[PDB]
UniProtKB/Swiss-Prot annotation, chains A, B:
Keyword check for Repressor: yes
Disulphides: none
Subunit structure: Homodimer, when bound to an operator.
UniProt function note: Binds to two sets of three contiguous operator sites in the phage genome.
Parent sequence residues shown: 2 to 64 of 95
Organism: Enterobacteria phage 434
Keywords: DNA-binding, Repressor, Transcription, Transcription regulation
Membrane-spanning intervals of the chain: none
Recorded GO MF terms: DNA binding
HTH cro/C1-type domain: residues covered: 6-59
Listed name of the protein: Repressor protein CI
The entry's DNA-binding region: 17-36
Length: 63, 63
DNA sequence: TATACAATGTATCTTGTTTG
DNA sequence: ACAAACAAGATACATTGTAT
């Protein structure tokens, strides 16, 4: 799940929702709504996936 | 722009906004604003790149 | 026909505050 | 005071219905 997936990778690169959230150009909370399943298709999905080193598809449909 | 690239890459596929909206899993209306600059980052962007047989970056930055 | 316009609803974003 | 969450008010995008 896109929340499990973004959380697990974030922890992995060893970042925190605020730092990730700078990399993504977004905010902590925005990164939070995401990770806590409060959003599904955020505007920065593309830019999130690139901060995470994965693909917008893997992110979406775990692949 | 993305509105621009969506138009052409659909124009050359013989799909109408409506039957493109059909593959993309969306309305014609939704395909119209995008192509017509009414929306920047559509949420069906992943499936779109997939109906236009391109990559989300190409669509996005045209690069 | 095929595309566009318009309003209303809903997702997501923002900023402020909050609890661990 | 550090890090993750809650919550109201704002905009961007979607949906529906209609019209060029």
């Amino acid at each position: 799940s896109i929340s499990s997936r973004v959380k697990s990778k974030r922890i992995q690169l060893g970042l925190n929702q605020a730092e990730l959230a700078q990399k993504v150009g977004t905010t902590q909370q925005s990164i939070e709504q995401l990770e806590n399943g409060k959003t599904k298709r955020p505007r920065f999905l593309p830019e999130l996936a690139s901060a995470l080193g994965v693909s917008v598809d893997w992110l979406l449909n775990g692949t």
